[model samples]
Each structure stands twice: as structure tokens, then as C-alpha cells.
Target chain A: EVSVEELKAIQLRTTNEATGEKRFGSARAIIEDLTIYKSDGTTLAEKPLIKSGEEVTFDFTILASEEIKDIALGISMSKAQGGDIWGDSNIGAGSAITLRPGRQRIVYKATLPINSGDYLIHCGLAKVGNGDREELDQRRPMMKVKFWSARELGGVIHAPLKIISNGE
Target chain B: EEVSVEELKAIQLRTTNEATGEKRFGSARAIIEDLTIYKSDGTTLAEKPLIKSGEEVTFDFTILASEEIKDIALGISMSKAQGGDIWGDSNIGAGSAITLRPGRQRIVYKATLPINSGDYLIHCGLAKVGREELDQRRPMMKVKFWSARELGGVIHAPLKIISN
Candidate 1:
């Protein structure tokens, strides 16, 4: 469950690439709430810890600032040490939507990786586009922009999730 | 100015040792010690410094080498705290090369943090000059002075840059 402290930790502002100005609070998209649950999909995971191969649910609400097309909710799991482990923007019907200037709820069910490690989960609203493969020589210039497959539209929320051995 | 991400990628690509035939030279290795970050003036210690975007800072550290080594260089890099992709890299004691005596050697590297506002991992390590490849124009590759994985690990400090 997203406690007051976790909500406070959510980054609601983002930098405008063209103007280099920060868009604060509701000026960009806002994550109204987020919750994580165990396999039962009802009991809240008190701690941000899970076991490998266990299934979990992510429920989040987003309030868009403007009408957005071909939008989706994205979640990315990356190693705390460094490197992206997994990410998915296609969470069922939520993957393709005409986002209006209002709050929308998205729910995603994910299975934890088999590998045991400390990981971080980033969730945000993003624009879904074709996944085209570009040559390294041609793509170098666009490296920064293409870092995330689902281009993040506004704010992002992150939490530390430790995936431990099943018995541990 | 903070080096661009492109430049950092280029540096990593250029310095990576690719020649499999190259041989290890000596038993010399350097360990990073006493890493400290300082404010712009380079005097006062920055305790969890709130650096502004595009502001300059100083990294002070001691290099404890096992033996005298020539043609050595040091690099300081900033990478995304979450993504782990290198954002900038600054090389000191490169080009002309520097000698590290068998003992403690203090070094200070100064750089302007990236203009982008975000948390970064400031990592620093030593590199040694290796034999030049078959190509005449290309310079010698810079390999790790010591196995970072074996020596515990390279120094990685957290830095947060804020924009006005």
C-alpha cells in the first residue's frame, strides 16, 4: 500500500526537454495512488519484499494533464546495482488507450524474476509506440531519448523491491 | 562542462581493451582510498552537498599503489543511479601518462556535474596503458589497473544534482 511517506516520495515533476524547465505537480501527470499486493491479490505487502517466482499485483491511478493517445501504464524492474532486468508496457487493455485529462486506474499482474537480488520498480504513464530496431551507429544520437521503450510522459513512482530465495 | 553521454560512451568504447594477445605487465595495482567530495572552491568538505545543475565540484582521493607503474591514468564517471548508464566521464593523468609510485598518492579531480537534474553514481578507478594494437594510428588501449571485481570493487559514491 502507498503510505503517506511513499506518496511523498513520488516525483510529481519532470523537466521539459525543449524549455529545460521543470513542470511541477499537476502541471504534468500525477500518480494518485499505488498499491502492491501478494499473490492473493487482496492482502497488501506490508514490506516491499517478495519471493522469486511469486506473483504480485500492481494497482495504480494516474491523472493525466492532457489528452494523450496510444498511452499505457509502464513498470520497469531494474537491478539496484545497475542494469534493467525486465519491463512491460503492454498490460492488457491498459496498453492501448486514449488517455483523457482525468484519473485512470491500471492494474498489472507480474511474476517476480527467478534470480534473487535487490531490484527497483518504476511505474509511470507512457506513450506506446512501435518497437523498431535501429542500428547502433544510427541510434547513438537518440540513445537518451530511447532509454525506455514506453516513453515516459510525466511523473514516475519508484519503490525498492527485494526478491529473495523462496525459503528465505 | 559535464561531458555528454555520447562522449562517455565513446570513452568507454575507446578505452576497453580488445586485444586478446596483450600480456599483463607488472604486479602493480592501485586502490582508491579516502574519497571526498568538495564544494566549488575545493576546500570545504561537502557533506551530502546539494549541488546545483552545471555547478562544479572536486573529488579528492588517495591512490595506494602496490608498486611503481608508468603510463597510468584515472577516470571519474557519473552514471544514472537507477539505469546504470554512464552519463559523463572525465579522465585525469591521461595522454602524457603519469607515474604512480609504490605508496600513497593523493589526486584531485574536478568536474562540472551534468546539467540534468538527477541522482548519479560517481565512480572512479585506475586504468593502465596497454600495448598498441595492429593499427598504427590508434592509441594504446587503457585496461583496468587491477581487477575491480577482485579488489572488492571500484569506488562508487552517490551524488544528487538539483536544478534551480
Candidate 2:
């Protein structure tokens, strides 16, 4: 019997691009077209890096659960204590999406709100139904991480990103 | 067979003590559609009176449809008598857009209330994917209705759902 829990598990369920059996936590939600550029729009190569104040774009898709509407697909930040501390409606409310009976693709460009630190960055989507938002949509097992150390950065756990600062 | 807001509005929003086949004045719009309270097994109660806290109550209702609506969803949420708004979780019972007997004008359903001490608002009507479709009159968007009263068109009533 397909339990309700399984029906609610929304994450990236795709096979690894390298054709490995290992699946990314973001299998329910696929994050792609990730790019970082300066205000002049200079596209970086390979691993996209940024500075504390530089602007960038983050894009992704959420695999929809059947019969569910108004599924909120936004970026979420969680700490060990508060669980999820922040949720970025990538782009804005105008860009917020509601997952239907299929996969929904989302693309938004904005600057990351970060400073000098070595922290693991996270991103994913969520669903807000009835009067409340569901759990999986808020804190899914999978998370895309960006490791930022001082002036440079990379994907320590999931995808790699960088930050170029005056110190670097 | 999704029901339109216009059709939902056309149906009787209120009823009276007579449960009359015809007219009954002195009564306001029904807080619920075909509202009938129940005991555990399925016994209908009289009037929309105050219920007890944590008291298990069941309700059976039918949408007095003016037109056929598909994917009809019936949901209930609680709010203070002071009235700001406490949202209902559509996942509970028939609250989510799961079933609505179509082809017939009156689509009926039943669900239990996890009764608590609060003034509850019982909401019904057609479920739509986006708020824009709720306002649309043509090319009918065929998704179930969440809160038909929301989006500023349909009529709703106050049950004064309270507890002691």
C-alpha cells in the first residue's frame, strides 16, 4: 500500500548525471541553470562563485504531487535549532509557483544575503495547503549546499558555488 | 464537472428551523452547506448549536448545486468569535479536493470534526487551482474548489461554533 507519507515525499528522484546509483537529496526538486555573474553580466566558468554582496541567479524545479495545489516552491534556510530559519521566494511572489500534477520549473535571479563565514548553504521548495504549510516542502531530506569560506566558495555537499571578495 | 462560483452563489446559502421545502425568513445565510451535525455513528443533531471541547462530531452535507461541479472540495476552518481568521488544513477529511459525486446537482459528503474550543467556520464550494480561475466565468477550470467563499464573491454564514 502506498502510504500517505510516500505520497507527500517531494524531492529530486533523478539518477545521477554520472550514471551512478547514488541519488542526490535534491532528487525530488531538480536545481539546474545555476549561474553567477557580475553586474556587467560576465559569466563565470565551471564552478560559479560570488562575493558577499554580489548578485546571482538560482533556478530549480519541484516535482509536483498529484491533486495538490498552491505548492509553495521557494528557497529555505534552516539552522540546527530553529529547523528552517528563512525561506526566499526566489524572485518574488510574482515568481512563486503552485505545483500541480507534474513537475514545475522555477528560475529566479537575485543576490545572496550572506557575509564573511564558513557556512553550508541550503535551498529547496515547500507546499502551503489548507491554512498551513506541509513539512516535507519546508524541510525535505535533500538539500543543495554551497560552502562559503571567506572570499572563495564551492559546493561542499551538493552543488559547488564560489564568492569573490576584496580580500580574495 | 467543476462548479463555478456563479453556480455556487445561485444555490441557497442559508436555511431555517423548518428545514423547509419552500421559504423561511428570519434566517441568515447558512454557515455551512446542508449543515447537519452528528454523533459518532451518524445521527443528525438539531440546529447549529454550541459543541463541547474535544467532543467528537460528524457532519453530513450536500452542495445544493445549481450546476454540476467537478472535483468539489469541502473544507472547514476555525476562527475566534472576534474574527481574524484561522485557516483550515485542506488535508483533513474531505477538506482536500478528493471526492464530489458529479453528474447530479447535489453533491454530498460526510466528515468528522475534531471539535475544539473555538468559533469554527465551515467552508464549502468548488475548488480551483489558482485564485484567478475562481473569478473566471468561462473556459471552466476543472479543479476542485477549496474555499469558494474566498476570492471575494461567494456568500458565507457565521455558525458561532463555540464550546464550554
Candidate 3:
């Protein structure tokens, strides 16, 4: 039988093309790959917690936004942790409102407040902005990244927030 | 016949920890076989889009993302191809991403924006994540479903993940 530590080493495997066989690590160690909220756990404050001169790009894509009926585009930065290990907090939001219809196209652009990870791109609805406003589709489409970075531009940015307002 | 049925069920459990169906949400997508990421305009991304030692190259994706990517493992080969009908130019596009979970309904959960000019398609086979070894030598079959990725200021959010 394999020892706990040995099992852990075998479980948490990494494949950094450069490292090859040397990419393996321990599982119990819990290697986190994000910021805004790092060390361990997920979620972060909307407020940035880094210095200046960092860069975060729109790397991952939803591929096609054609089927998106209602879209509430905004980047949800980490704020604070809630209950349990998988806690959540709304520290900050991003600018740039986009519209991607099955037959149309749009782009949401905005620089991050800090060079941090552990962020999310929320695209649905459910009381963003003032946290007091509500929308038609309250379901926020969420995307999580393990490892990410941000820009040096600090401070919050408020997009005009085109909530589609109304449509089919 | 019943013996075969039980055996099949056991095989399913090995690759899939039936112990936590509720937590795992469900089994791995049926088949994450092979996937080709092409630019939206109908082209393929570089075989090895991943930058080594901090390499960043922006390629256009003609289309948006489709299906839920339970786990995305990027692989590269010298060979690759452009996108369309053909499977792959034997010596063409080699760096392919095998989808361990070809989710349903949405890809990336939203519109993969800044599509420079290409398309990416996820095909079928081996949709297993963290399923390295098995009783035998063969890769175990998986169960596919439609699941979305929830993220935060990072790659993956530590939301409630119930793994077996």
C-alpha cells in the first residue's frame, strides 16, 4: 500500500512541458493557483490588494456567446471569504459591458484594479453594482481560473453598466 | 449476463468514485477524445499556444467557446492543422487539448471573446481528470454532462467542490 505522503505526491501531478516528470508535487500541500485570494481557499474582495504595474488579459474565452439570451458582463474580484472553505465575497467589479448574441458580437474591455488572481468573470445577473439593484435574469454565469494576474491600475472602475436593460 | 452487468458497474466506479455522486455532481463526460482549437475565421491556434518562460501570443478565434470544460489539459505535438471538416492533417496540428469533460450547452460558460481569427472544436474519447491509474492498463470510460466553470480572481475558484 502507498503511504499518505507518497499517495499525495502521486495525486497532485503537474505537467509543465518544461519540467516533464519533475512536475509532480504533494496533494496535501494544496497548491493554490490564484490571487485576490491566495494562500488557500477561493473568492476575494472587490477591492484590489496589490501594488502597481501588473497586467491581466482576457485569456480564456466562452468561445461562442451566440446562445446567450441575457448577458450581465462584469469581472467579480475577490472581496472576502464567507462560510465554509468555499466562501465568497464581492470586493470589486470591472468595467466594459458587452453583448454577444447567437447572431451578434460584442466585447467587454476593462483593466483589472490589481495584479491578482482568484477572480471571476460573472456574465449573468443577480444584483451587481450597488448590490441593491436587481435584474431580469438573476443567474450569474461564472468562470473560475486557477492561476491569473492583474494590471497595476488600482482603484475601482464602474462601467456605465449596460444591463441589456430590455430585450427578447 | 448479469455478471457482465455487475462488472461494467464496477468498472464505472473505479474511474468514477460512485461514493460521491451527489458531490461529484456526476461522472466524467462520456468521451473527451480529442479537441482542435481553431481560430473563428476557420483556422487553428498554434499547436503549442502556451508560452514557455512567459510566452504570450494572441491568436484570433473566429467562434466562441462551446461546451463545459470540466478539465482542460493542453498537449502539443509538432503536427497540427487548420479547422474545418478534415480530422487533422497527420503531420499537421499535433498540439491538441483532450477534453476530459466535454460539457453541454455552454463552453467557458460565456462568450470566448477577442476571437482574433480562428475556431476551436472539442471532439470525443478519454474524458477523465485525475484518473491516472486503473485496475488494468486501459483508460476507464467516463460519463459526460453539462456543467459550467465558476471562477474568481484566479484560474479556478474554491467554491464547493465535492470530489470522491
Q: Of the candidates shown, which would achieve the greatest lDDT relative to the real structure? A: 1
Q: Could you tell me every candidate's TM-score relative to the true structure?
A: 0.32, 0.30, 0.19
User: Which residue pairs of candidate 1 clash?
Assistant: none
TM (chain A) per model: 0.54, 0.49, 0.28
Per-residue CA lDDT of model 1 for B2-92, tens digit only, reads 3333443343345433442212222224444345666565444434445544346666656555556566655454444343323233232
Score each candidate by Cα lDDT.
Answer: 0.40, 0.34, 0.25
Compose the digit string of candidate 2's lDDT tens values, residues A1-168.
223334344223332333122323322333322333444566545443445434555445445435444544445433322243233452234333444445445555544433233332344454455776554433342333332434321111111111111010
Q: In model 2, which runs have C-alpha deviations exceeding 4 angstroms?
A: A1-45, A65-67, A77-86, A90-96, A136-168, B1-164
Error of 3 at A165 (Å): 52
Error of 3 at B131 (Å): 49
lDDT of 3 by residue, A22-86 (tens): 22322222111222332322233443332222233222122222232323433343322211112
The regions of model 1 sitting more than 4 angstroms off are A1-168, B1-28, B41-48, B90-96, B131-164
Error of 1 at A14 (Å): 29
DockQ of every predicted complex: 0.02, 0.01, 0.02
- The regions of model 3 sitting more than 4 angstroms off are A1-53, A57-72, A79-101, A115-117, A125-141, A146-168, B1-164
